[PDB]
Amino acid sequence: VCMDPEPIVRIVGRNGLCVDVRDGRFHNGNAIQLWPCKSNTDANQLWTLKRDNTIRSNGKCLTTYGYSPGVYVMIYDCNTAATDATRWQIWDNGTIINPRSSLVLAATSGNSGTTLTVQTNIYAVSQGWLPTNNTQPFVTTIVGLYGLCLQANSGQVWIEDCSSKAEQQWALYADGSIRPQQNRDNCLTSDSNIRETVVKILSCGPASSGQRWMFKNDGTILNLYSGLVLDVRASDPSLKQIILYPLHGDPNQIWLPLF
Amino acid sequence: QLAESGGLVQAGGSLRLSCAASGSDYAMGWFRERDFVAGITSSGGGTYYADSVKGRFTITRDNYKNTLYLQMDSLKPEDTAVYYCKGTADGSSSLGYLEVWGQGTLVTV
Amino acid sequence: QYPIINFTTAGATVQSYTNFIRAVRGRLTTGADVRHEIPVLPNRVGLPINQRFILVELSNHAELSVTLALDVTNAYVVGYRAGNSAYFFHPDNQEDAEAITHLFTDVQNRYTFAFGGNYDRLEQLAGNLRENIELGNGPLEEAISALYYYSTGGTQLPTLARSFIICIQMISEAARFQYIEGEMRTRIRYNRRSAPDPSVITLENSWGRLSTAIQESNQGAFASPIQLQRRNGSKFSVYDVSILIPIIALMVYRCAP
Ligand SMILES: *[C@@H]1O[C@H](CO)[C@@H](O[C@@H]2O[C@H](CO)[C@@H](O[C@@H]3O[C@H](CO)[C@@H](O)[C@H](O)[C@@H]3O)[C@H](O)[C@H]2NC(C)=O)[C@H](O)[C@H]1NC(C)=O
Ligand SMILES: *[C@@H]1O[C@H](CO)[C@@H](O[C@@H]2O[C@H](CO)[C@@H](O)[C@H](O)[C@H]2NC(C)=O)[C@H](O)[C@H]1NC(C)=O
Ligand SMILES: *[C@@H]1O[C@H](CO)[C@@H](O)[C@H](O[C@@H]2O[C@@H](C)[C@@H](O)[C@@H](O)[C@@H]2O)[C@H]1NC(C)=O
Ligand SMILES: [Cl-]
Ligand SMILES: [Zn+2]
Ligand SMILES: [Zn+2]
Ligand SMILES: [Zn+2]
Ligand SMILES: [Zn+2]
């Protein structure tokens, strides 16, 4: 069986902010919050992923206040807290879930200082997390059908001849959002779950389920809540339409992040 | 290269358009300014229809015969136009990909 | 007879190359062992000899044909057949030396090179690094003919080593990485030849370490960062499997889940 390590790491999420023990106070019950990612050895942003499914900062446990949607997440002594309230699973699609409650770690607002909570899982941007020491999103070109490049043009998105154009650069944030490099307040967005809905660029404000994406091992870019993938409509770039569409795997649904 | 065929009937009729290819690698679609009507991916498995014609038109393909179809049921005077076949492919161009058209077939309803 | 997958450079397309690489992966591993959505090749421990290898038959415009043999446990080329002669890289140990005796049994001439099939020795024998050996349909065509004529006296050793470097990247590495496969599809799509950029080189160099970091990660988070390179020289670190899911398609087996 493989060794299970215990790496110390930051947890980056909504709008690229870091999971933070507020004001560096480790009193039992002090809230966990979003905060700009530090670049030092401060303990309140460095988390040990322990073998017992515990996530620890300065020796104390990331702990949910309860098992109902909307209760806050605190720091608490690992031995004193209810054991089930200290246990978490980090899923490969960016979800951090509390197994006992089946509720998911969330930042229901995007501002610095937002109190973290547990919410019902809807695979929204507000519930996307990444354990990493990288505090900057990865900027990349996204190549797709016929080797053409995903291109941002204000609200509209389409695929067009690649040319090393800031309109063709994309910031992959730790919360699962895909942001145009020129304006990181905005997000690749599907306004809804319906098949053939046109994907566009809108504000990352709502941090919705339509704004969260995962690059799958099969080359598709998946919207987790709907289960639909990005698709160059009719496999015709001239339509200038990128849509949500059920998975069929043909070349108009294959993408590659060329970093 | 692509050539159309099968292009008059009253409102509410039926007509099937064919599209004979010379050379499966190609996504294929129908157009009718030119406007998108229907499209299908190379292997099939993805069919995408324009909103106007959805629920009335059926695009199909058959890559062992190298022919593309467009079934047109419940036609209206709104469908009267020149119907072109179109294909998109992987090669090099100013687009960055290949676009081969047809010569067009007239339909009048 | 071991499973055979065929590819021809004659009229090769993006699609035909994709079908080929997909087919190779389907015969390299069953796909039932998946760690953090990334397939794992079979464990060498427990793998019977009659399932140890797969065959990749390459042909070109001149209808020269050559058959590479791939170890399914690491997707790497261990040797090749051309006509009624077969050649093999110097095996690392005695068991791999025994295992290749089960390849191309019908062939009347069998030879083991004094050199192994690692890039470092192939590069010095070719007189050039991967960073300058162009890849694409054309180079694959020429690599096929050079491999074919090595039985004849017509292929010098550097050209042979260069042909190995071409086939290994375009077949084995593309099987290991969707990223490298997409790089090859870029060359085929535009009928261009191009040396691989540093991102490809570092991915190839890190494949073993990446497999270990992923399989021994704590829920995807690595114990130590792995340093990769962008397409320009720029270096960055990876701490989590999430960015590698669309990058790596196969891992060498390291340990049990
Ligand atoms: C991400 O960055 C953080 C902060 O730079 C790294 O945390 C540091 O990790 C090292 C090695 O894991 C820790 O040192 C170790 O300390 C133990 C306990 O004394 C000792 O037995 C080891 O030999 C080693 O010296 C260090 O304390 C820790 N710093 C903190 C928590 O402030 C972290 O490793 C980085 N993560 C990755 C995956 O690179
Ligand atoms: C996100 O990842 C988790 C963890 O891999 C997925 O949950 C598992 O999905 C598999 C496949 O359906 C089930 O067999 C497991 O029982 C699920 N739970 C666990 C704890 O492994 C989850 O489905 C993923 N979500 C999406 C939308 O893909
Ligand atoms: C490559 O070419 C040979 C000869 O034309 C084919 O036999 C191969 O088919 C594969 O092997 C046979 C034995 C059978 O299992 C068939 O189902 C396989 O597909 C062919 N290889 C491939 C991958 O098509
Ligand atoms: Cl979460
Ligand atoms: Zn206090
Ligand atoms: Zn995992
Ligand atoms: Zn020896
Ligand atoms: Zn080197």
Side-chain angles (χ1 to χ4, degrees):
Chain A
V1 172
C2 313
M3 49 195 91
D4 203 351
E6 293 185 333
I8 307 148
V9 83
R10 294 171 210 284
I11 307 175
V12 191
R14 175 179 190 164
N15 306 324
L17 306 174
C18 271
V19 165
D20 180 281
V21 184
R22 186 150 52 217
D23 292 298
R25 294 312 266 141
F26 294 95
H27 302 155
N28 284 333
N30 186 39
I32 309 304
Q33 68 173 1
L34 283 194
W35 192 257
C37 288
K38 292 197 182 152
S39 269
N40 54 32
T41 55
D42 283 354
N44 75 322
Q45 274 183 19
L46 292 156
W47 296 88
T48 308
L49 307 186
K50 301 269 320 173
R51 282 178 207 104
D52 59 357
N53 277 304
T54 279
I55 303 178
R56 305 223 181 169
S57 174
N58 199 22
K60 304 181 86 108
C61 273
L62 180 87
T63 310
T64 171
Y65 179 81
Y67 308 126
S68 295
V71 308
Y72 85 115
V73 181
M74 58 197 181
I75 193 78
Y76 211 96
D77 178 329
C78 298
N79 324 129
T80 50
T83 63
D84 288 345
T86 69
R87 305 292 168 135
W88 304 88
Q89 288 179 358
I90 317 191
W91 290 353
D92 304 309
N93 46 46
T95 293
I96 302 193
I97 185 171
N98 170 256
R100 155 83 178 281
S101 69
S102 295
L103 297 178
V104 152
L105 182 70
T108 55
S109 157
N111 306 115
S112 300
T114 299
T115 293
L116 288 203
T117 52
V118 293
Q119 304 288 340
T120 307
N121 193 7
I122 52 175
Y123 293 104
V125 170
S126 54
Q127 323 171 326
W129 310 95
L130 204 76
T132 178
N133 271 10
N134 284 333
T135 67
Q136 298 296 124
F138 274 17
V139 193
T140 188
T141 284
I142 295 166
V143 185
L145 175 77
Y146 305 149
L148 306 157
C149 277
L150 198 65
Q151 189 167 301
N153 307 270
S154 273
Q156 286 183 236
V157 200
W158 64 62
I159 219 174
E160 192 192 289
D161 192 44
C162 296
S163 100
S164 44
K165 303 180 71 150
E167 292 81 23
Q168 282 173 12
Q169 312 286 320
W170 299 89
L172 311 176
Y173 273 64
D175 57 14
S177 59
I178 299 179
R179 319 217 166 179
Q181 167 69 359
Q182 268 152 331
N183 165 44
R184 297 162 159 240
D185 296 312
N186 282 24
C187 267
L188 195 79
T189 309
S190 44
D191 51 53
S192 51
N193 275 350
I194 308 95
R195 74 193 273 159
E196 268 186 338
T197 181
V198 173
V199 181
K200 50 183 84 159
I201 298 149
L202 294 154
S203 170
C204 306
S208 67
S209 315
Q211 273 165 341
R212 184 160 165 202
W213 313 86
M214 165 184 208
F215 287 72
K216 307 289 295 172
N217 188 252
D218 59 5
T220 66
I221 300 181
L222 178 75
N223 166 260
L224 289 162
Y225 180 72
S226 75
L228 310 182
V229 303
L230 288 166
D231 168 321
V232 185
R233 177 166 192 239
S235 180
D236 187 332
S238 72
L239 296 183
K240 300 187 168 149
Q241 302 253 52
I242 317 297
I243 59 173
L244 275 199
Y245 203 74
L247 167 80
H248 54 55
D250 263 15
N252 63 311
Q253 292 177 357
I254 303 304
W255 308 85
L256 187 75
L258 272 200
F259 51 93
Chain B
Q1 299 91 249
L2 297 163
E4 295 92 332
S5 41
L8 162 72
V9 80
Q10 289 177 350
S14 280
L15 260 176
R16 178 179 113 137
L17 306 173
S18 281
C19 165
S22 79
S24 148
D25 285 339
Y26 278 68
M28 312 290 318
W30 289 97
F31 285 66
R32 101 191 181 278
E33 59 273 21
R34 303 165 150 100
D35 227 340
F36 174 78
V37 178
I40 179 174
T41 66
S42 44
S43 99
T47 65
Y48 312 78
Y49 294 100
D51 251 335
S52 158
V53 302
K54 199 185 194 172
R56 305 180 11 243
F57 285 14
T58 297
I59 187 172
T60 43
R61 79 181 297 150
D62 161 24
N63 303 341
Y64 295 112
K65 187 63 222 171
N66 298 326
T67 299
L68 178 94
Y69 308 107
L70 165 53
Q71 208 52 41
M72 306 173 56
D73 297 340
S74 159
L75 300 101
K76 282 89 178 72
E78 292 70 340
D79 299 345
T80 285
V82 50
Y83 279 64
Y84 302 95
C85 54
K86 165 176 181 164
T88 65
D90 267 286
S92 305
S93 73
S94 47
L95 301 181
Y97 69 101
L98 318 183
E99 266 191 9
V100 175
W101 286 95
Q103 205 51 255
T105 192
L106 53 149
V107 85
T108 301
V109 179
Chain C
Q1 247 301 340
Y2 288 106
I4 310 181
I5 305 91
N6 320 283
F7 181 72
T8 177
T9 60
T13 57
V14 168
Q15 184 66 66
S16 87
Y17 181 71
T18 309
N19 298 139
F20 167 59
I21 293 305
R22 257 156 211 193
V24 171
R25 300 199 186 112
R27 282 299 162 137
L28 278 171
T29 184
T30 201
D33 186 9
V34 178
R35 318 288 172 82
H36 320 80
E37 329 210 332
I38 286 155
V40 190
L41 294 169
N43 197 348
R44 154 84 196 102
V45 180
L47 198 62
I49 179 59
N50 62 6
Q51 299 179 281
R52 179 59 186 273
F53 301 106
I54 57 166
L55 302 187
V56 167
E57 163 157 66
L58 310 171
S59 58
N60 59 16
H61 277 111
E63 193 141 45
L64 297 182
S65 180
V66 85
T67 303
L68 315 184
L70 272 68
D71 193 322
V72 308
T73 70
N74 55 26
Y76 214 82
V77 173
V78 301
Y80 84 96
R81 164 184 216 180
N84 287 107
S85 295
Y87 306 86
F88 305 86
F89 295 133
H90 197 283
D92 311 338
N93 52 49
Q94 199 40 241
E95 306 138 346
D96 288 355
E98 168 292 320
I100 55 172
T101 66
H102 291 58
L103 287 163
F104 311 123
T105 52
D106 54 344
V107 84
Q108 81 156 43
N109 293 88
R110 313 178 60 85
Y111 319 85
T112 302
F113 299 117
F115 52 92
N118 55 285
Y119 288 128
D120 175 78
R121 185 75 179 110
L122 291 175
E123 277 168 349
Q124 49 178 275
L125 285 175
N128 211 342
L129 303 165
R130 279 165 290 162
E131 283 92 332
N132 285 127
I133 296 166
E134 288 140 302
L135 304 174
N137 204 225
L140 186 51
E141 279 240 339
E142 291 137 30
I144 287 163
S145 294
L147 284 167
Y148 183 89
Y149 288 119
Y150 186 72
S151 161
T152 315
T155 297
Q156 305 281 76
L157 193 44
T159 298
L160 188 75
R162 198 171 59 247
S163 298
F164 278 130
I165 294 175
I166 280 149
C167 293
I168 292 171
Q169 291 183 87
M170 281 187 92
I171 287 154
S172 292
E173 302 290 358
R176 290 166 171 183
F177 299 95
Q178 315 92 308
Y179 184 89
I180 298 182
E181 173 204 350
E183 294 261 342
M184 296 317 108
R185 98 167 40 102
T186 294
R187 285 144 178 89
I188 288 156
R189 176 182 288 114
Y190 300 119
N191 166 245
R192 80 173 58 150
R193 74 179 56 208
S194 272
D197 57 51
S199 68
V200 171
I201 298 298
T202 296
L203 281 174
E204 288 163 357
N205 292 338
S206 314
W207 185 65
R209 291 170 268 151
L210 288 170
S211 301
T212 297
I214 294 170
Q215 290 171 54
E216 307 178 342
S217 80
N218 186 345
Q219 305 182 106
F222 301 157
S224 323
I226 289 293
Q227 195 174 238
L228 299 179
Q229 272 189 294
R230 303 184 171 91
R231 279 184 302 155
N232 57 25
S234 169
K235 310 178 184 193
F236 61 98
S237 294
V238 173
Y239 297 80
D240 198 272
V241 71
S242 273
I243 192 48
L244 295 165
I245 295 193
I247 299 314
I248 328 178
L250 316 162
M251 298 182 291
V252 52
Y253 187 98
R254 296 303 208 201
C255 47

